[PDB]
Amino acid sequence: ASPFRLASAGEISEVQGILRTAGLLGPEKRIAYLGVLDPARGAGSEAEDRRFRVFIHDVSGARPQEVTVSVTNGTVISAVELDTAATGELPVLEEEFEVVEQLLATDERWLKALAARNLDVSKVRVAPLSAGVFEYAEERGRRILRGLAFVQDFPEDSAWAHPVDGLVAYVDVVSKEVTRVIDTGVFPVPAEHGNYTDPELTGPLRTTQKPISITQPEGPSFTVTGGNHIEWEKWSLDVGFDVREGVVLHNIAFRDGDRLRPIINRASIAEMVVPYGDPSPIRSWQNYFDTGEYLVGQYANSLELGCDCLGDITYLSPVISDAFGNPREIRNGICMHEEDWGILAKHSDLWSGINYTRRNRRMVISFFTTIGNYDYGFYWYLYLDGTIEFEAKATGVVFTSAFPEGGSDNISQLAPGLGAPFHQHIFSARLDMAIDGFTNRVEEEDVVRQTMGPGNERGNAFSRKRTVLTRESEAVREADARTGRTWIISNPESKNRLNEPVGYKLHAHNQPTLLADPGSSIARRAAFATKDLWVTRYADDERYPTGDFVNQHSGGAGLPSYIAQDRDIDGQDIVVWHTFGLTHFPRVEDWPIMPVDTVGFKLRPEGFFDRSPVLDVPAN
């Protein structure tokens, strides 16, 4: 009867019934977000209260509502009218994707622009892109999408190969009006196709790959109980799923002898931003918060055995709500399997004659999502030795433009006339820490160079230093690869047998953070992305680094607002927010469909155990 179980179809159907009976879900209403709430701190209240948070959009133009319901008692707990001109718009609705294209196909400004290019309107696909906040005063308080156009020569053609440059339009999707059509000039529409299943492009398929067969003759080493509770090789955790964040990990704990030791209370990718670095007015507004604006969980793929997931695979099929409150299953949306991971430890000793070798393994929990041209894999790994790792795998088709004549400093050429603007993919991991319990602190650890001198006569010594972050106002930290900078999360009140506080070390990849000018709109709205590491004091309502309503919010919400409270974080219930990402200068090899690139982070124990935790691993 776990309070962390996945939402079921019945629960979502009950939410729909509660909302209807209360007068909050009539025919003009649409569910823009629905998700279970985590239990409050202190689950000592016997019998859970399963509560759901709902964002309700109104297609007639009335103010949207934030609603909290209790499925256990069948009641609405609170319902607030939202002022979107102040606190932001609701997430983009799937049913609004196609509205941008159909409104434009009857606008005389759009039709004139296509006529000048000799384009047939029935072939022109329009991408529904989030709008952000810029200089247009008339957009404040309106639900706006912007559209960029692509030509599809036939229904199975890859539109991405034929961008229509110099053209962009703004659309009010509630009142169904085209507010602006901007035409800066005619660019040739790149003519080459990018159809990666066309034999004339692929050539004959290779016949040289022989099968790799991965099987587990006795089944997998993990167990799944209660729908979503996993036990594997001393690890214990609950796999949750949220329509906004996707896969969420709860209650990550490690069985050290007879005691179950907490490590991480909740782990998630709480935000995602893709800023574009092309100064053209056609695209200079382009930034997508795939998590906060589009909800990456609702676009999760059904993963196919032997193709997306290879081996002995256990699936979860999470349930989300559609825009009317009906339950919708994402079949095979989450893959879980263990896999071989090479040598764990090895030594051949000259003096004792003992030869020792052990294999490593990792548990894999993953899902894939597709938002327009992009596809992202999210991978959580648990290792035998206590290491936790996250990996994002980026692929799909690159977003394209024309490639200007005479060149560009902000676009690379993929094909004759075909460009791909420079951009970043930046992630925010939110790690609600519980190292051996909830009294935690973070230290920044730097390598220390020492000078040749007395007490260091041969000039060989080096050391390290640790700086405790004591208040939120000093807990906004930058990477420093040169000094080997890492961060340790420790529990000052739980000691290992050497009398040191137990800890975990965060190892970052030290990739560049947000490159946009600090005075830009995106730097205000994506402030979390300007620094590598933030630490806050836990609070129930501080869930996203960008705030609750990212769509068309003017900036400053989320982490900078939280940090300003300057709360005590030295030995407290704390949350670590780690920013990491990829800076993408597209290459020719990324076209017409791009090979996976990856980024991530990991946490390794740092005096958490009293000795290696994998001494009891057998030889096999």
What length is written for the chain? 620
Q: Active-site residue among 33, 170, 276, 374? A: 374
Annotated binding-site positions = 288-299, 371-376, 423, 425, 584
When the beta carbons of 44 and 199 are compared against its own copies, the nearer one is 199
* Interface positions with Cu ion (CB under 5 A): 584
For residue 134, the number of C-alpha atoms closer than 13 Å in the C-beta half-sphere is 13
Choosing among Cu ion, its own copies, none, which partner's interface includes residue 351 (Cβ < 5 to 8 Å by kind)? Answer: its own copies
The answer to whether residues 501 and 606 touch, using CB atoms and an 8 Å cutoff, is no
Instruction: State how far the Cα of 535 lies from the Cα of 46, in Å rounded to an integer.
Output: 32
Q: Active-site residue among 290, 312, 436, 548? A: 290
Determine phi and psi for 233, rounding to 5 degrees: 50, 55
Q: Shortest approach of its own copies to residue 572 CB, angstroms? A: 25
Burial class (CB in 10 A: 0-12, 13-18, 19+), 217: exposed
Annotated binding-site positions for Cu cation = 423, 425, 584
Q: Shortest approach of Cu ion to residue 418 CB, angstroms? A: 15
When the beta carbons of 173 and 411 are compared against Cu ion, the nearer one is 411
Choosing among its own copies, Cu ion, none, which partner's interface includes residue 75 (Cβ < 5 to 8 Å by kind)? Answer: none
Task: Give the number of other CB atoms < 10 A from CB of residue 544.
Answer: 23
Choosing among its own copies, Cu ion, none, which partner's interface includes residue 121 (Cβ < 5 to 8 Å by kind)? Answer: none
| Sequence-separated (6 or more) residues with CB below 8 Å from residue 383 | 341, 360, 361, 362, 389
Sign, Cα dihedral of 515, 596, 361, 620:
negative
Instruction: State how far the Cα of 464 lies from the Cα of 204, in Å rounded to an integer.
Output: 57
When the beta carbons of 150 and 538 are compared against its own copies, the nearer one is 150
Q: Residue 238 has which token pair?
A: 């609950």
The answer to whether residues 371 and 97 touch, using CB atoms and an 8 Å cutoff, is no
Q: Residue 215 has which token pair?
A: 């099987």
Q: Shortest approach of its own copies to residue 7 CB, angstroms? A: 24
Q: Shortest approach of Cu ion to residue 219 CB, angstroms? A: 38
Q: What secondary structure does DSSP assign to 440-506, as a single string?
A: BEEEEEEEEE--SBTTBTTS--EEEEEEE--BGGG-EE---GGGT-EEEEEEEEEE-TTSPEEEEEE
When the beta carbons of 455 and 595 are compared against Cu ion, the nearer one is 595
Q: Shortest approach of Cu ion to residue 560 CB, angstroms? A: 26
The answer to whether residues 270 and 428 touch, using CB atoms and an 8 Å cutoff, is yes
Q: Shortest approach of Cu ion to residue 129 CB, angstroms? A: 15
Determine phi and psi for 548, rounding to 5 degrees: -85, -30
For residue 70, the number of C-alpha atoms closer than 13 Å in the C-beta half-sphere is 11
Give, as one character, the DSSP assignment of residue 389: E
Annotated binding-site positions for substrate = 288-299, 371-376
Q: Shortest approach of its own copies to residue 200 CB, angstroms? A: 11
When the beta carbons of 23 and 459 are compared against its own copies, the nearer one is 459
When the beta carbons of 210 and 259 are compared against its own copies, the nearer one is 210
- 538 included as an active-site residue: no
Strand partners, 486: 445
When the beta carbons of 269 and 514 are compared against its own copies, the nearer one is 514
Instruction: State how far the Cα of 225 lies from the Cα of 568, in Å rounded to an integer.
Output: 38
Q: Shortest approach of its own copies to residue 386 CB, angstroms? A: 7
* Amino acid letter, 26: G
Q: What does the radius of gyration of the chain's CA atoms come to, in whole angstroms?
A: 26
When the beta carbons of 244 and 584 are compared against Cu ion, the nearer one is 584
- 290 included as an active-site residue: yes
Choosing among Cu ion, its own copies, none, which partner's interface includes residue 584 (Cβ < 5 to 8 Å by kind)? Answer: Cu ion
Choosing among its own copies, Cu ion, none, which partner's interface includes residue 523 (Cβ < 5 to 8 Å by kind)? Answer: its own copies
Instruction: State how far the Cα of 197 lies from the Cα of 202, in Å rounded to an integer.
Output: 7
Q: Beta 144-151 vs 124-130: how paired, if at all?
A: antiparallel
C-alpha triplet 607, 613, 614: angle, nearest 5°? 145
Which positions are annotated as active-site residues? 290, 374
